[PDB]
């Protein structure tokens, strides 16, 4: 059952009792990440095994 999703990257620590549902791809480097993909661009949401 992989329907359970969890966030893996975020710009900064979220404040208490805050819900984040953004699906924008994450960039782990200084290079820009245009479109839906790019160099070392990772989807923030990872399923659960």
């Amino acid at each position: 059952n992989y329907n359970y999703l969890y966030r893996l990257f975020r710009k900064s620590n979220l404040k208490p009792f805050e819900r984040d549902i953004s699906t924008e791809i994450y960039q782990a480097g200084s290079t820009p990440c245009n479109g839906v993909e790019g160099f070392n661009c990772y989807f923030p949401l990872q399923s659960y095994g």
Partner: protein, 49 residues
Amino acid sequence: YAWNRKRISNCVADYSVLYNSASFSTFKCYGVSPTKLNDLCFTNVYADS
């Protein structure tokens, strides 16, 4: 089976020139992150090539 081990110590292990380079295909840190790599001090680093 005879991987060479080189001890790296007493220096600055800069990664800006390393990560930013696009010549690499796969690079994952399972215990640390490039963002916090600079702000972390290591006692000794060994390279197995």
